[PDB]
Design a protein around this ligand. Structure first.
Ligand SMILES: NS(=O)(=O)c1ccc2ncsc2c1
Lengths: 156, 39
């Protein structure tokens, strides 16, 4: 199967035609995505198979073939880029200054960008090209617009 | 049955389209991983 680093679409043929349910990042031989995209199911890459290695519904993250490898964090000051991969559309970088999700357990970066549900798992990057988190888990604020957390895992 | 297809490299694009605001929101996270607004 294809194991080259980069961004990948998560597809399914169970519904009508081929549908894009999400996006993920392949880094250091490990595929990283959001839990709600795959629900922890096995994945296919050509003739190869990827099995879930670690996952957590509350964090809304899952890794395949090995432990979570992404550890870069937003610095709290600089603009970032969502590397949006929309269903049936070419990958595109959108630059933005993240807002903040204030929680009882600390603050998290948030990106106010609106994309179809099948874009969940698209990486959010810093100026060095490092993945600081995945797009796709957030909230709908007054007016109907979407704001996603910058969801990052822990590297053991 | 789910499959993956490569979509590109992960690189920063100089002169990318700049959009989106920076809202500061009070949110709560439940055990199901769902975010919600606090008031
Ligand atoms: N099911 S969900 O709440 O994770 C969701 C909903 C809308 C949406 N819009 C862009 S990414 C995305 C994800």
């Amino acid at each position: 199967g294809e194991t080259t680093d980069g961004v990948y679409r998560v597809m399914t043929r169970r519904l009508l035609g081929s549908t894009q349910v999400g996006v993920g990042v392949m880094q250091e031989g490990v595929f990283h995505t959001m839990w709600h995209v795959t629900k922890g199911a096995a994945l296919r890459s050509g003739e190869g198979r990827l099995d879930p290695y670690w996952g957590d519904v509350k964090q809304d993250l899952v890794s395949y073939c090995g432990p979570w490898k992404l550890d870069a964090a937003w610095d709290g000051l600089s603009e970032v880029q969502l590397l949006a991969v929309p269903p049936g559309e070419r990958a595109k970088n959108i630059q933005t200054l993240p807002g903040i999700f204030k929680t009882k357990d600390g603050d998290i970066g948030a990106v106010a960008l609106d994309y179809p549900a099948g874009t969940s798992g698209s990486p959010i990057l810093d100026k060095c090209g490092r993945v600081i988190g995945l797009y796709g888990n957030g909230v709908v604020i007054k007016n109907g617009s979407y704001v996603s957390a910058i969801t990052q895992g822990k590297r053991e | 049955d789910m499959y993956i297809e490569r979509a590109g490299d992960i690189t920063w694009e100089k002169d990318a389209e700049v959009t989106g605001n920076s809202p500061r929101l009070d949110v709560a996270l439940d055990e199901s991983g769902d975010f919600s607004l606090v008031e």
